[PDB]
Amino acid sequence: ISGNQTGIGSIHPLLHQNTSDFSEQKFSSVFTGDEFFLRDHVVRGKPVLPGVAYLEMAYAAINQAAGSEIGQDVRIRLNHTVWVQPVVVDRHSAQVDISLFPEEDGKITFDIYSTQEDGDDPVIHSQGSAELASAAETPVADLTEMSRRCGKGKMSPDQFYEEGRSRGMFHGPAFQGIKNVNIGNREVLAQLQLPEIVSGTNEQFVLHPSIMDSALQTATICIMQELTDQKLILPFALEELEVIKGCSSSMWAYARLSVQKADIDVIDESGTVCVRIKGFSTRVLEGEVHT
Ligand SMILES: [Cl-]
Ligand code: NA
Ligand code: NA
């Protein structure tokens, strides 16, 4: 707590202030489009808050609200999460709020939403649920076997990011986390690296938007295998996300097909699975993003 000793700051770059009242646990943030996760995530000309920023926002909110209930052997697990309507930050700043509702069974539901003026009908951008889970069992990946099965072709960053720009998905420097992609049959293995432009941010995030979006990029490569060539697809839902361990700045994303859903493991150099996602799905965007 700063109070008057020094200037009061954000709780987290995606969770600026606690605005909780007797009716509701809630937080509020203001984004202008200058942030790395907006300027470098541009969907047919419009900066859009990426899916992965909502996951980290929920994670940070839950970690704040649940406080000392989170001991060393307790992990946050996100359950079924949907992205309903995009946050577009083109002409004017966006005020993005999150409310958390602790349920009787120990689950937590969250809404992420915005309003233009006070007491407007909120626009719902995303909705999900979560629970606190007993650590228990750190899964491991066989990166050797994964490589071996993904030997059907190599996709370079220059290929991938250019194909994106061609479809209208502009990943700027902070979101070019993919270093290499090995293509398998209904599975892919990508090497990830935190881009140098955000190398000073690795301690600020648990789910780092650069790394996590590069993981979802990897899954979209896997999914696009089974779709029309030049379709832009964007995150639509995920069924589960478990944070096992802290993500480092060199990682791997393994994605496999299960709407076409994908499972994704984000893996450190040692082979430890750090984040595990199940049932990630996408939807095609035609035309421009609207809200
Ligand atoms: Cl657009
Ligand atoms: Na995205
Ligand atoms: Na993509």
Swiss-Prot record:
Taxonomic superkingdom: Bacteria
Region of interest (N-terminal hotdog fold), residue spans: 12-137
Entry annotation: catalytic residues: 41 (proton acceptor), 213 (proton donor)
Domain PKS/mFAS DH residue range list: 12-291
Other remarks in the entry: The acyl carrier 2 domain binds glycine.
Family under the similarity heading: Belongs to the ATP-dependent AMP-binding enzyme family.
Record's protein name: Polyketide synthase PksJ
Species this protein is from: Bacillus subtilis (strain 168)
Gene this chain is encoded by: pksJ
Shown stretch of the complete protein: 2363 to 2661 of 5043
